[PDB]
Amino acid sequence: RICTGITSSNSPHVVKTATQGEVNVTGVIPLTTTPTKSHFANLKGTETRGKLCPKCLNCTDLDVALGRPKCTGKIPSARVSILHEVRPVTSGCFPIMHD
Amino acid sequence: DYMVQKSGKTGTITYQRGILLPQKVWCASGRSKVIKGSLPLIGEADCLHEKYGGLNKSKPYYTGEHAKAIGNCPIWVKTPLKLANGTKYRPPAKLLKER
Amino acid sequence: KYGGLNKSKPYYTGEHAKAIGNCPIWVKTPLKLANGTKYRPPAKLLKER
Amino acid sequence: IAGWHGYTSHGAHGVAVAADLKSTQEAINKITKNLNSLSELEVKNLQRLSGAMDELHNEILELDEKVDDLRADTISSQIELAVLLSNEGIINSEDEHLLALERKLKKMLGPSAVEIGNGCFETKHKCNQTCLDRIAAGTFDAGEFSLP
Amino acid sequence: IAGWHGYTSHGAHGVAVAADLKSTQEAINKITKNLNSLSELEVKNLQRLSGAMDELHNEILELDEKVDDLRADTISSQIELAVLLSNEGIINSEDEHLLALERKLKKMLGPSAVEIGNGCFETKHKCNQTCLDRIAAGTFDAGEFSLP
Amino acid sequence: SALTQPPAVSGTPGQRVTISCSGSDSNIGRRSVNWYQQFPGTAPKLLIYSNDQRPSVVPDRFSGSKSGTSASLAISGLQSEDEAEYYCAAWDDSLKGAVFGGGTQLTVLGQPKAAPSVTLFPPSSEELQANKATLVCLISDFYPGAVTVAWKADSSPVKAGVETTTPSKQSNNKYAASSYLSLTPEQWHRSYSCQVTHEGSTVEKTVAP
Amino acid sequence: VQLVQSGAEVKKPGSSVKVSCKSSGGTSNNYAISWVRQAPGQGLDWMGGISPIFGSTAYAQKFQGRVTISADIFSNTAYMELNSLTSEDTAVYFCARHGNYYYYSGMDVWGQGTTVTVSSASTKGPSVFPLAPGGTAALGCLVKDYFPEPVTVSWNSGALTSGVHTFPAVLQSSGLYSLSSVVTVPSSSLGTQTYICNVNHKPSNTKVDKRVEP
Ligand SMILES: *[C@@H]1O[C@H](CO)[C@@H](O[C@@H]2O[C@H](CO)[C@@H](O)[C@H](O)[C@H]2NC(C)=O)[C@H](O)[C@H]1NC(C)=O
Ligand SMILES: *[C@@H]1O[C@H](CO)[C@@H](O[C@@H]2O[C@H](CO)[C@@H](O)[C@H](O)[C@H]2NC(C)=O)[C@H](O)[C@H]1NC(C)=O
Ligand SMILES: *[C@@H]1O[C@H](CO)[C@@H](O)[C@H](O)[C@H]1NC(C)=O
Numbered sequence A: 001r002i003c004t005g006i007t008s009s010n011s012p013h014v015v016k017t018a019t020q021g022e023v024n025v026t027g028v029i030p031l032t033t034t035p036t037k038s039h040f041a042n043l044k045g046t047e048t049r050g051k052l053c054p055k056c057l058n059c060t061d062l063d064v065a066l067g068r069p070k071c072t073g074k075i076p077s078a079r080v081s082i083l084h085e086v087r088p089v090t091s092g093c094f095p096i097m098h099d
Numbered sequence B: 001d002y003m004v005q006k007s008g009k010t011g012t013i014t015y016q017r018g019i020l021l022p023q024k025v026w027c028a029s030g031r032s033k034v035i036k037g038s039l040p041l042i043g044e045a046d047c048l049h050e051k052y053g054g055l056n057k058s059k060p061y062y063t064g065e066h067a068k069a070i071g072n073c074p075i076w077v078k079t080p081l082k083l084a085n086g087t088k089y090r091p092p093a094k095l096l097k098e099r
Numbered sequence C: 001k002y003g004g005l006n007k008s009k010p011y012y013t014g015e016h017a018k019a020i021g022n023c024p025i026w027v028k029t030p031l032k033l034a035n036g037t038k039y040r041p042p043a044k045l046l047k048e049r
Numbered sequence D, E: 001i002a003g004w005h006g007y008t009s010h011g012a013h014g015v016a017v018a019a020d021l022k023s024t025q026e027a028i029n030k031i032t033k034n035l036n037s038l039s040e041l042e043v044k045n046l047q048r049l050s051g052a053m054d055e056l057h058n059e060i061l062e063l064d065e066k067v068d069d070l071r072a073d074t075i076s077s078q079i080e081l082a083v084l085l086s087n088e089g090i091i092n093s094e095d096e097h098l099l100a101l102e103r104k105l106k107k108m109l110g111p112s113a114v115e116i117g118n119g120c121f122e123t124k125h126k127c128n129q130t131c132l133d134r135i136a137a138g139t140f141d142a143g144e145f146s147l148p
Numbered sequence F: 001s002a003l004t005q006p007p008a009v010s011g012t013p014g015q016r017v018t019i020s021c022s023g024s025d026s027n028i029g030r031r032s033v034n035w036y037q038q039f040p041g042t043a044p045k046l047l048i049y050s051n052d053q054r055p056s057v058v059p060d061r062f063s064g065s066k067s068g069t070s071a072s073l074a075i076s077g078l079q080s081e082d083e084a085e086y087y088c089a090a091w092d093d094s095l096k097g098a099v100f101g102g103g104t105q106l107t108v109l110g111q112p113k114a115a116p117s118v119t120l121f122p123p124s125s126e127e128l129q130a131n132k133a134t135l136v137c138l139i140s141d142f143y144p145g146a147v148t149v150a151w152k153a154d155s156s157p158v159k160a161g162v163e164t165t166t167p168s169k170q171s172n173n174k175y176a177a178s179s180y181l182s183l184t185p186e187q188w189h190r191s192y193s194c195q196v197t198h199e200g201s202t203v204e205k206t207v208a209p
Numbered sequence G: 001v002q003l004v005q006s007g008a009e010v011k012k013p014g015s016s017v018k019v020s021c022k023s024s025g026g027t028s029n030n031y032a033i034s035w036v037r038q039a040p041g042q043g044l045d046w047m048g049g050i051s052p053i054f055g056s057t058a059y060a061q062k063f064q065g066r067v068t069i070s071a072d073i074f075s076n077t078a079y080m081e082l083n084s085l086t087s088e089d090t091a092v093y094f095c096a097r098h099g100n101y102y103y104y105s106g107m108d109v110w111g112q113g114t115t116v117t118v119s120s121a122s123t124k125g126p127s128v129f130p131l132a133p134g135g136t137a138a139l140g141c142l143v144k145d146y147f148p149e150p151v152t153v154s155w156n157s158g159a160l161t162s163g164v165h166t167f168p169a170v171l172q173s174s175g176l177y178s179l180s181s182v183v184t185v186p187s188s189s190l191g192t193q194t195y196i197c198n199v200n201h202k203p204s205n206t207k208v209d210k211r212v213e214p
Helices: A061-066 D021-039 D058-107 D128-137 E021-039 E058-107 E128-137 F025-029 F125-129
Strands: A002-006 A013-016 A022-025 A028-030 A080-083 B033-036 B047-049 B053-055 B069-071 B082-084 D006-009 D016-019 E005-009 E016-019 F008-011 F017-022 F033-038 F045-048 F062-067 F070-075 F084-092 F097-100 F104-108 F117-121 F133-142 F148-153 F162-164 F175-183 F192-198 F201-207 G002-005 G009-011 G017-024 G033-038 G044-051 G056-059 G067-072 G077-082 G091-097 G114-118 G127-130 G136-146 G164-166 G177-186 G196-201 G206-211
Touching (some): A022 E058, B033 B069, B082 E021, B082 E058, D006 D128, D016 D128, D021 D058, E005 E021, E021 E058, F008 F017, F033 F062, F045 F062, F070 F084, F097 G044, F117 F192, F117 F201, F117 G136, F125 F133, F133 F192, F133 G177, F148 F175, F175 F192, G002 G091, G009 G017, G017 G091, G017 G114, G044 G067, G127 G206, G136 G196
Parallel strands (some): A080 B033, G009 G114
Antiparallel strands (some): A002 E005, A013 A022, A028 B082, B047 B053, D006 D016, E005 E016, F017 F070, F033 F045, F033 F084, F084 F097, F084 F104, F117 F133, F192 F201, G044 G056, G091 G114, G127 G136, G136 G177, G164 G177
């Protein structure tokens, strides 16, 4: 007695189709995950601008933007940048009434 | 304050006493891709995501909080999609019936 | 455009506009769901009355 | 006159008619699942910008209107395809059911009958209501009339 | 216990099992082509406007958020349909393969056997592993046991 | 009506009881019979369908059969909770509509005498302010379900303003009733008493203004 | 699935009524639904039915011409409209779903039941009066002088339902019936749990909440 047929895991897994609705299948591959939160990072394949002038130590972006003394120096080009201050602050020099 | 001068155009300033006259000015070109994030940047990642931070594309799609992102990123989807990897159902036939 | 309306059917045709709540969805043409069998203007597998 | 899927009988008793309840129902359920699915699509609505004021922000409001207009069109096309796909699945399920009805008219009433290839058969025996009702009920035995 | 597509054998030797490599593989390849295709969809990402500043351009930023929100939804629906269509094609390829396996179990083991219409057959001869392995290898000849 | 069933059947706990349903060729003859069970004041439930098929929630002690233009429901191993009204039903091909029997009441013998619990509430202050007074006598958990109530107005009985309900059976298969005394606030004497006599014995309660 | 029939109705003879069914937790559109009434002390009686996807509406001969049955497939709702009303029509209406698309199968699910009272007079919302109360105690809500039937009693926004015994109503010679309820709970449950008695009355749209202190 020789049969052809298809062997299965004999367990149901619902998938959806365009015209036939739900169908039970012997296996599935999940195509999604739910990610979890962690720190930001450099983007692989790029130079990522965080600070405008990371070699300018003890300077903020606004400090650099105003040309505060000791906060000058080359600003690296970047195709990708991270906005880390919604309200950039100074950290030295002559007092400003910012707002 | 600052004023932006575009495409080679001249700006003007009117002033009285106490004027801080412009000296060095910023010269900028091109466009960077910007998203919100926080410093410091730790290591590297395939993808930077506004809500999840740095993440690696483990699967082609993700569920969760959609947000702005840059790089080689999974694509947001509403439901946990599943690819078929199997044969149909058939809770199983007795074309033999033994053990 | 229509003011207050009740979702009598899942879709509507007409003037698209901003709206809030539990609303029918705007569509370009009067869509129709099949509710039947095929055609077959009819066979004489008997032919009588 | 109920039924949607069913059977006929010619012969000397004139013509006679009976309905296959399960085949009728499954065709029905296929249509109702599609209707429910199309009735439960979730699409977000469109409102005004809260921050953009008339007169002050006319340029932004023009763009807002533009985003809405293109969105409506896209969703309309997206919904239209869903209906077209539903109709595809419903119409295809018809052929599955009909073919399954022929294989049932071939399992019953035995080899003594001959198939027209029409969904219709020519039987040796008489039929009429009661005999046709048993075909519809799936309890018809050929051996009633001493047949194979 | 390998295989996905394959054959069985009852008889006096108890039950026995063997796998059709090509039919198994082609089913597989169909799934892997779909996975690759779905893994290589290209969709552009969304970032901030470079020109729009917080506090100054809040009205524009609200609209920007709105464009993003509607876009995510549209792409989600678009991707979802792609998966549903993939699953459709994979499931349909199953029936093509099974039907092709029956026509192969009908080409081999000759007219001496009788088809149950079950994907299964009743053979005159004994089978067991070796005889079933040749059915799986496509080298089985009926004439081994002097048969048609 | 169309299908006919006996108005009453009875039995003792654990006995087998049967209920018949006679029809005609135009109903039972050519169509399937269904049976329903109904408890008082609630909607009917399906007990049997397609002649001989039970729902999963229905106990197997219930069975049905059909012969000719007649049908029958049998209940093996009777329990006290099976006391209820029963209806048969079928489609009729002549009337082109569904028909029902007149219903059969099944009674389960075997229930214990129970003396009545009585509670008697005096008129509320709120009601007096609205220039009415109602004495509320609530009678519960008695069996057999026959009670007679007397209202004692000091020690004479009152000839008017007494209204008493019929006995309704409880969830615990015993019975309940209630009686209302309506009086002007002026009439609301030093003592009023509700007297409930049940099988000779009399239960009493009293309230004082 | 659960099917919720509409509220209680009070109608003048000759007017009509409409009774809507609603099924919750799934559609019933792929099944037949029938309407069945029960006069007081009387048996079940088929009015007609509907099978909304099939496209069929059927009627009992005894009601032909006077009853209209309908459905809204988009809201998963069925309706029954009965015209030319008469005291003879005063009874409990029942809707039920069948096992299939047609009226042959045995109706396995039903409504809680609609009761419609016909007559020629204005109605009345009753006052709520409450009774005051070991092992266990008893306490009662006294619902006086209403017309007509029915009323519902609720205790503790329906969370309480243990030992709740809503007594039948006694029709006074005046026309209005009284109703009361008795609920039993333990004795010590006295000074920690406040009981709340709500007595709906749809015909007059009444809805008073009464609390009652020992
Ligand atoms: C995403 O993958 C990258 C590698 O592609 C991870 O970067 C590594 O980080 C850890 C600790 O910082 C170390 O293994 C290496 O310093 C990094 N490897 C490379 C090749 O740079 C990164 O950690 C991953 N991100 C997450 C959230 O898991
Ligand atoms: C779904 O299709 C059915 C047909 O199968 C429709 O019912 C028909 O209604 C029209 C006019 O009312 C007539 O052709 C027949 O009286 C009905 N057919 C049957 C078999 O009873 C039904 O109306 C359709 N549904 C909707 C919402 O239009
Ligand atoms: C799929 O499997 C479920 C049980 O997991 C079953 O209830 C359902 O009927 C199956 N689908 C089909 C189409 O038979």
